[PDB]
Amino acid sequence: HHHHFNLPPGNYKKPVLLYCSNGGHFLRILPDGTVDGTRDRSDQHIQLQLSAESVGEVYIKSTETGQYLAMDTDGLLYGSQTPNEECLFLERLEENHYNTYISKKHAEKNWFVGLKKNGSVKRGPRTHYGQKAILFLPLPV
């Protein structure tokens, strides 16, 4: 147990857009497996479906391509065709409002899903508690 257990109130009944408070980008998983952010609300690759695998642990899946968000051994996010250990994230409430996603595999290292102000994803080791890059709001599609 390396992290707190404050959980967000939302559920996984329907797909969502994961809006990053840092630069206002939506998390996107492109067909080729690339992960980044875009401000284009009409983009077809920002619709994501979350599912609970265990209380507080989720998969984040592209509804358009079926790919799973995953963080590799060097902290880089990628789209995986199949669910694996790198695809589980600890979904937590942060600052009493936002959702944060910590890599379960690398939870002890405090590696988060984060977006920079320019729309590029942050590498795990460059993220940490306290940043704006790690704060997301799940918006209904």
Side-chain angles (χ1 to χ4, degrees), residues 125-140:
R126 300 315 169 206
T127 61
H128 50 77
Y129 276 116
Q131 299 180 325
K132 301 296 186 187
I134 67 175
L135 306 176
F136 292 86
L137 287 168
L139 309 180

Side-chain angles (χ1 to χ4, degrees), residues 60-120:
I60 292 164
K61 184 194 290 175
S62 161
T63 60
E64 185 63 38
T65 68
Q67 293 173 95
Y68 291 76
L69 184 68
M71 180 174 280
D72 76 21
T73 189
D74 284 317
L76 296 184
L77 294 177
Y78 70 100
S80 182
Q81 298 285 141
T82 50
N84 58 44
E85 83 223 280
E86 303 184 328
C87 299
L88 284 177
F89 293 89
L90 306 185
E91 178 186 67
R92 294 291 180 279
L93 185 70
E94 182 56 273
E95 296 174 18
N96 303 96
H97 178 63
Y98 301 98
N99 284 21
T100 52
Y101 295 89
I102 294 156
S103 158
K104 179 180 179 185
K105 171 67 173 180
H106 301 286
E108 184 159 19
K109 299 190 271 284
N110 292 19
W111 290 4
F112 298 81
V113 172
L115 277 166
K116 298 179 49 68
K117 292 172 174 171
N118 66 12
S120 69

Side-chain angles (χ1 to χ4, degrees), residues 14-44:
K14 45 192 293 167
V16 298
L17 307 184
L18 284 181
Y19 175 82
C20 184
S21 169
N22 194 25
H25 298 86
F26 299 105
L27 192 66
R28 181 170 66 173
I29 307 175
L30 295 171
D32 74 353
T34 297
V35 181
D36 64 358
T38 180
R39 293 204 180 89
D40 175 15
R41 209 287 198 195
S42 75
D43 192 288
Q44 297 300 115

